[PDB]
Curated annotation (Swiss-Prot), chains A, B:
Residues of the full protein shown: 766 to 813 of 1032
SUBUNIT field: Homodimer. Interacts (via C-terminus) with VP1 in the cytoplasm. Capsid VP3 interacts with VP2.
Species: Drosophila x virus (isolate Chung/1996) (DXV)
Subcellular location: Virion; Host cytoplasm
Disulfide bridge positions per record: none
Protein name: Capsid protein VP3
């Protein structure tokens, strides 16, 4: 049921509460490693 | 130099362009696996 806006808002709140995650994601994205970030997080979530 | 607001806004734009990442992060966070998400992304970013 949750919409994309609700998912984004939930992640936004999580990033604010966990600055390490925000800083690590920005570092990976801004340094051109976002594709490795996508692949790694998707694989982890699919193996729940 | 980039501020927290700029980092968050950069991630927001990235999530919108890559729905898989948004969906995988929400799935991990909402199912109580956010700590594993933090640890995995931080380690990857530190090994750049």
């Amino acid at each position: 049921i949750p919409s994309s806006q609700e998912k984004i808002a939930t992640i936004h709140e999580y990033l604010l509460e966990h600055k390490e995650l925000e800083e690590a994601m920005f570092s990976l994205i801004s340094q051109g490693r976002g594709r490795s970030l996508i692949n790694m997080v998707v694989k982890s979530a699919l193996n729940i």
